[PDB]
C-alpha cells in the first residue's frame, strides 16, 4: 500500500466535476464528516486499467509522493476504491488548470513580468526534480498548472523516469516529438539536458501566448511542410533539428529571452545550461528591470 488506505475512503470522495485528460482527472471533495464537505482535491484515474498501465500508475504515484516543492503539484494520498481493488491518485486542485489554457483564457492578466515569473518557478521546480535524479520527459505548458496569478506548479508526472545509479541518461524502450531533444528523437535518450530542451520549448510557448498557428507543432509543420504525413514528418524534423533549424522568435519576445531559448536548443547536450543557470538568469533579468 503506497498510501494509507484509510486516508481517502471512496465513500467520502464526492464527485464535483470532470477535468479531462495522461489518464483521466476529476475534481472531488473529500467529505468525511457526514455533509460537512471539506477539502477539494483532484483525483487521477486510469482510462484503460491494464496491468502495465497500473504499474506505470504506481510508478507515477511513487514519483509524486516523493516530491515536496512550492512549484510541484502536491501529493495528498491514494484512494483504494472498488473495495480496495482499484487505484486512484489524490493531489491538490489548481483552480486555473493548465498553463496553456490559462494563457489562452486569461490574457487580460498576463504580461511579460508574469511570464518571467512562471519561467523562474518552472526552473526551480525542475531543479528540485533534478535533485531527485528524475527526468520529467514531458515538459509543456499543458502539463504545468496554475494555482493563481503568481504561482505555477509542474504536474503530470506520468512519463517521469528515474535515472540509473551509474548513468546520466535514461534510455526509454517503450510521444510529444515537437518538444523532444534531437538525441531523444534519434536515440530515445532522456536526461536533465533533454528536459532543458523541452523547457526552451516551454519558454517559446509562454512568449507565443499560444495564439493561432504559433504552437510548436503548427510552427514545425509550417517549416517542414503541411503536405507531409507519417514518419517522414519525424524524419524531416530530425534533419531540421540536426542543422540548426529552430522555432522562430515569437512576436514581441525580447532578444534575451530568445537567446535563452536558443541556448536551451543546443544540439550539444553538455553545452545546454542547467536549470540553476536558467533560474538565476531569469531572476536576474526580472530583478534588473525598473
Ligand atoms: N491536479 C490538477 N488540478 C487541475 N486543475 C484544473 C484542470 C482543468 C480545468 S478545466 N476543465 O480546463 O477548466 C480546471 C482546473 N488539474 N490537475 C491535474 O492534475 C490535470 C493535469 F495535470 C492535466 C490534465 C488535467 C488535469 F486535471
Hey, what domains does the chain have and what are their CATH numbers?
A: 1-93 (3.30.200.20), 94-287 (1.10.510.10)
* 76 CB burial (10 A radius; 0-12, 13-18, 19+): buried
Output the CA angle 91-93-97, nearest 5 degrees.
125
d(CA 236, CA 214): 19
Q: Work out which ligand 1 atom sits closest to the CA atom of 20.
A: 25
What 3-state class would DSSP assign to 190?
A: strand
d(CA 223, CA 247): 9
Compute CA 259 distance to the chain's CA centroid, rounded to the nearest angstrom.
Answer: 22
Give me the residue label for grid cell 542543422: 243
What 3-state class would DSSP assign to 145?
A: strand
| Closest by Cα among 85, 219, 65, 64 to 143 | 64
For residue 107, say whether it is annotated as part of any ligand binding site: no
CA-nearest residue, atom 12 of ligand 1: 97
What 3-state class would DSSP assign to 195?
A: helix
Q: For residues 195 and 264, is the Cβ–Cβ distance under 8 A?
A: no
Element containing residue 186 per DSSP (H, E): helix 182-187
How close is the Cα of 31 to the center of ligand 1, in Å?
20
How many other C-beta atoms can be found within 10 angstroms of the C-beta atom of residue 198? Answer: 24
Q: For residues 159 and 139, is the Cβ–Cβ distance under 8 A?
A: no
Active-site positions read 138
Resolution in A: 2.3
Compute CA 51 distance to the chain's CA centroid, rounded to the nearest angstrom.
Answer: 25
CA distances from residue 178 to 22, 209, 237 in whole angstroms, order as listed? 17, 17, 8
d(CA 67, CA 55): 19
How close is the Cα of 247 to the center of ligand 1, in Å?
28
Mutate which of 145, 156, 176 for ligand 1 pocket (most atoms within 8 A of beta carbon): 145
Q: Is the dihedral of CA 226, 231, 235, 240 positive or negative?
A: positive
Long-range contacts of 60-65 (CB under 8 A, 24+ apart): 60/89, 60/157, 60/158, 60/160, 61/2, 61/3, 61/87, 61/89, 62/2, 63/134, 63/157, 63/160, 63/162, 64/89, 64/91, 64/157, 65/2, 65/3
Half-sphere exposure of 264 (CA within 13 A, CB side): 30
Report the DSSP pairing between strands 88-92 and 134-135: unpaired
CA distances from residue 151 to 120, 210, 261 in whole angstroms, order as listed? 10, 19, 22
Bridge partners, 189 (sequence order): 171
Q: What is the CA radius of gyration of the chain?
A: 20
d(CA 195, CA 188): 13
For residue 124, say whether it is annotated as part of any ligand binding site: no
Q: Read off the DSSP letter of residue 157.
A: -
Q: Work out which ligand 1 atom sits closest to the CA atom of 156.
A: 22
d(CA 171, CA 173): 6
Q: How was this structure determined?
A: X-ray
Please state the length of the chain: 290
Q: Which residues line ligand 1 (CB under 6 A)?
A: 19-21, 25, 42, 73, 91-95, 97, 101, 145, 155-156
* 213 CB burial (10 A radius; 0-12, 13-18, 19+): exposed
Q: Read off the DSSP letter of residue 185.
A: H
Q: For residues 116 and 282, is the Cβ–Cβ distance under 8 A?
A: yes
> Phi/psi at 46 (nearest 5 deg)?
-85, 155
Q: For residues 200 and 178, is the Cβ–Cβ distance under 8 A?
A: no
Per residue, the 3-state secondary structure of 129-141, as one string, reads HHHCCEECCCCCH
Q: Read off the DSSP letter of residue 268.
A: S
Q: For residues 28 and 58, is the Cβ–Cβ distance under 8 A?
A: no
For residue 1, say whether it is annotated as part of any ligand binding site: no
Amino acid at each position: 500500500f503506497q498510501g494509507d488506505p484509510t486516508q481517502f475512503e471512496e465513500r467520502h470522495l464526492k464527485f464535483l466535476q470532470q477535468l479531462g485528460k495522461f489518464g483521466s482527472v476529476e475534481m472531488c471533495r473529500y467529505d468525511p464528516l457526514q455533509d460537512n464537505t471539506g477539502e477539494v482535491v483532484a483525483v487521477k484515474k486510469l482510462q484503460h486499467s491494464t496491468e502495465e498501465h497500473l504499474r506505470d500508475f504506481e510508478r507515477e504515484i511513487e514519483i509524486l509522493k516523493s516530491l515536496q516543492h512550492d512549484n510541484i503539484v502536491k501529493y495528498k494520498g491514494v484512494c483504494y476504491s472498488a473495495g480496495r481493488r482499484n487505484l486512484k491518485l489524490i493531489m491538490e486542485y489548481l483552480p486555473y488548470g493548465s498553463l496553456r489554457d490559462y494563457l489562452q483564457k486569461h490574457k487580460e492578466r498576463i504580461d511579460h513580468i508574469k511570464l518571467l515569473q512562471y519561467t523562474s518557478q518552472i526552473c526551480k521546480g525542475m531543479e528540485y526534480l533534478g535533485t531527485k535524479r528524475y527526468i520529467h520527459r514531458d515538459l509543456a505548458t499543458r502539463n504545468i498548472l496554475v494555482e493563481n496569478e503568481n504561482r505555477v506548479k509542474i504536474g503530470d508526472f506520468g512519463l517521469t523516469k528515474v535515472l540509473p545509479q551509474d548513468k546520466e541518461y535514461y534510455k526509454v524502450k517503450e510521444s510529444p516529438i515537437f518538444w523532444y531533444a534531437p538525441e531523444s528523437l534519434t536515440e530515445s535518450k532522456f536526461s536533465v539536458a533533454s528536459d532543458v530542451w523541452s523547457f526552451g520549448v516551454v519558454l517559446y510557448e509562454l512568449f507565443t501566448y499560444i495564439e493561432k498557428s504559433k504552437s510548436p507543432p503548427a510552427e514545425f509543420m509550417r517549416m517542414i511542410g503541411n503536405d507531409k504525413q507519417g514518419q517522414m514528418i519525424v524524419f524531416h524534423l530530425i534533419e531540421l533539428l540536426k542543422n540548426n533549424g529552430r522555432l522562430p522568435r515569437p512576436d514581441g519576445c525580447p532578444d534575451e529571452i530568445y537567446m535563452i531559448m536558443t541556448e536551451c536548443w543546443n544540439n550539444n547536450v553538455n553545452q545546454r545550461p542547467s536549470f540553476r543557470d536558467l533560474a538565476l538568469r531569469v531572476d536576474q533579468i526580472r530583478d534588473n528591470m525598473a
